[PDB]
Structure 1
Amino acid sequence: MENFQKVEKIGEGTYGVVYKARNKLTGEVVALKKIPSTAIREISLLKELNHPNIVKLLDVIHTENKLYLVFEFLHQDLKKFMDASALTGIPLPLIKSYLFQLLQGLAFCHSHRVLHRDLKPQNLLINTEGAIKLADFGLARAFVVTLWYRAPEILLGCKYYSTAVDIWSLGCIFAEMVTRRALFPGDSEIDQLFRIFRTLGTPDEVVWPGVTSMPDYKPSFPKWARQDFSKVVPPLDEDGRSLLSQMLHYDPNKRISAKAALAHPFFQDVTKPVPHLRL
């Protein structure tokens, strides 16, 4: 750690405080996160998982029984950019570019059987060039927490969840970029589940075979009817609504993969605009 000078406290991440810091040996500006043998091996595997849409894990420092993770630094997260674009809205070509780039990042990680498990605007980082990158990828398997982007199978007690959990989270983020409001802002596990059910309908054996046998499923859940996506994400066009609907399928097996989402007609006219960033 003496090779790093703290510059700015970014904030309280999921596993520890993230700082902007300077490497005294290279002059490199990095993000430093201050966090068992199982964790060291899993974290070290993430150092190999390199993609332009994944925030690079530069180094793992284990000293005095403490763990420091050194990452590539980006200047802004999607939460700040969404708050800054609240009055105007993020232009649809930029939302589309960001969704496409994040689907590329997920297709890569998922092809290597690596899940994020905790996608949210706070871990999506952006730069002046128009890139967007997934931060803290794979740390959840390695080691108030927001529930807004949690997949229904996690909420219902699935212990062996799939890559589909990240597609759900990304679908929630996509809807939030479009509407300028969180899709399912639950403030408890049951409030989160019930907000999902009130929009998408209470799941049953017809739409999700095996749902009634899940650990936290209760036959006493209220039965709400599904709403149209035209009501959920206006004024998003039918290509965007159709893609979103597939990213929000209840059955994780029916839910679109990142690879298949990249081929969706919504991306026929994808471009890479440059955002209006004040740093």
Structure 2
Amino acid sequence: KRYEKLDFLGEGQFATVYKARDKNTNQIVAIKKINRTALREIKLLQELSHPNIIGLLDAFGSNISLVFDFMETDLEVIIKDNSLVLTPSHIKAYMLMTLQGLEYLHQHRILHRDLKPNNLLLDENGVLKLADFGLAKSFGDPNVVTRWYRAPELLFGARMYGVGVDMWAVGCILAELLLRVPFLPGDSDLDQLTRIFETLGTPTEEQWPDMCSLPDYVTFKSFPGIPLHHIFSAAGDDLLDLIQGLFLFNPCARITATQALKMKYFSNRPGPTPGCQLPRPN
């Protein structure tokens, strides 16, 4: 075979994943040995080419094997690792790679729909790539991330939706970088809306006009919500406005990947850390 099977990387409800060596270029890779979460990581990734999106390098039959770039670490590992402190500049660099990847996705009319820390992968040189495109779909296709990163429209059972689903998840990732714990850990779908509205305030028909006409909208307790300078007490105003923009309840008011990258936080000092100096676990 083409590959030298090095390590077992893990098992899910799709695939057995493996570290391996490409036996003719000596390049280290990752192989996803596995229908519809499989045929639509190929349909999308052999198409796409962006530094901050995982590359599909080869594939074959009888189980399907899918050969991506090997990444040493991921953002969940960095978050969990106590030896690493995250300076403002490391966070800006993680956010800037994550947003430049999604802005190209959203410009190619694709929703990732599964953004979590553990799908933001990180190669030895500190390039963040988005991975796990098995829940991704085109803006066009007719009709949903893990509960903690899930937008309130989806929790009120919205049937059509867009960019905002991925942008809410990015905000939850930014909060977890800054707080180093999950921002909104709901134990259920209803608890998830309880925590959202207890943290950010129970919205109105002004904050969110068609909210009362969502398929699963239900009258929640009013909560004032905590101000974002209390939760993110070390964050500057430039960063507090990025957060405020990604956590707006109205999905169309909610800031896009392009509007996020046009915010002053990304041109303000301190600019993002070089890839090669981003913190490294062992």
Which residue pairs with 2:272 in the alignment?
271
Structure 1 residue 116, shift from structure 2 partner: 0.9
Give the letter aligned to residue 45 of structure 2: L
State how far apart, in whole Å, the 1-side matches of 2:121 and 2:94 are. Answer: 10
Equivalent residue of 1:133, what SS?
strand
Which residue pairs with 1:7 in the alignment?
6
Match of 2:106 among 103, 106, 110: 110
Give the letter aligned to residue 272 of structure 1: T
Which residue pairs with 1:186 in the alignment?
186
Which residue pairs with 1:56 in the alignment?
55
Which residue pairs with 2:141 in the alignment?
none
Equivalent residue of 1:71, what SS?
strand
Question: Residues 45 and 55 of structure 2 are in contact (CA less than 8 Å); yes or no, is this contact kept in structure 1?
Answer: no
State how far apart, in whole Å, the 2-side matches of 1:23 and 1:77 are. Answer: 22
Structure 1 residue 26, shift from structure 2 partner: 3.4
Structure 1 pair 12/195, CA: closer, same or farther in 2 (3 Å)?
farther
Equivalent residue of 1:148, what SS?
helix
Q: Which moved more, 1:111-120 or 1:183-192?
A: 183-192
Which residue pairs with 2:64 in the alignment?
67
State how far apart, in whole Å, the 1-side matches of 2:27 and 2:166 are. Answer: 31
Which residue pairs with 1:47 in the alignment?
46
State how far apart, in whole Å, the 2-side matches of 1:104 and 1:138 are. Answer: 20
Question: Residues 77 and 124 of structure 1 are in contact (CA less than 8 Å); yes or no, is this contact kept in structure 2?
Answer: yes
Which residue pairs with 1:78 in the alignment?
75
Structure 1 pair 264/39, CA: closer, same or farther in 2 (3 Å)?
same
TM-score (norm 2): 0.88
* Match status 1:96 vs 2:92: yes
Structure 1 pair 57/176, CA: closer, same or farther in 2 (3 Å)?
same
Deviations 1:28-76 (A, max 9, x none): 3211113348963673332121101111122343x32x33221111100
Deviations 1:211-236 (A, max 9, x none): 111111112x2222222001222211
Question: What CA RMSD, in Å, does the superposition of the two structures yield over aligned residues?
Answer: 2.4
Structure 1 residue 199, shift from structure 2 partner: 0.7
Pairing 1:22-37 to 2, within 5 Å after superposition: 22-36=21-35
State how far apart, in whole Å, the 2-side matches of 1:42 and 1:258 are. Answer: 22
The number of residues matched between the two structures is 273
Give the letter aligned to residue 178 of structure 1: L
Equivalent residue of 2:184, what SS?
coil
Structure 1 pair 69/173, CA: closer, same or farther in 2 (3 Å)?
same
Structure 1 residue 27, shift from structure 2 partner: 2.8
Q: Which moved more, 1:12-21 or 1:48-57?
A: 12-21
* Match status 1:162 vs 2:162: yes
State how far apart, in whole Å, the 2-side matches of 1:53 and 1:36 are. Answer: 26
Equivalent residue of 1:49, what SS?
coil
Structure 1 pair 17/150, CA: closer, same or farther in 2 (3 Å)?
farther
Equivalent residue of 1:210, what SS?
helix
Question: Residues 112 and 133 of structure 2 are in contact (CA less than 8 Å); yes or no, is this contact kept in structure 1?
Answer: yes
Pairing 1:195-214 to 2, within 5 Å after superposition: 195-214=195-214
Question: Residues 117 and 138 of structure 1 are in contact (CA less than 8 Å); yes or no, is this contact kept in structure 2?
Answer: no
Q: Percent identity among equivalent residues?
A: 44
Q: Which moved more, 1:262-271 or 1:127-136?
A: 127-136
Q: Which moved more, 1:242-251 or 1:17-26?
A: 17-26
Which residue pairs with 2:142 in the alignment?
none
State how far apart, in whole Å, the 1-side matches of 2:171 and 2:32 are. Answer: 27
Equivalent residue of 2:51, what SS?
coil
Question: Residues 58 and 71 of structure 1 are in contact (CA less than 8 Å); yes or no, is this contact kept in structure 2?
Answer: yes
State how far apart, in whole Å, the 2-side matches of 1:176 and 1:42 are. Answer: 27
Q: Which runs of 5+ in 2 are unaligned?
A: 139-144
Structure 1 residue 18, shift from structure 2 partner: 2.3
TM-score (norm 1): 0.89
State how far apart, in whole Å, the 1-side matches of 2:16 and 2:251 are. Answer: 33
State how far apart, in whole Å, the 1-side matches of 2:161 and 2:280 are. Answer: 36
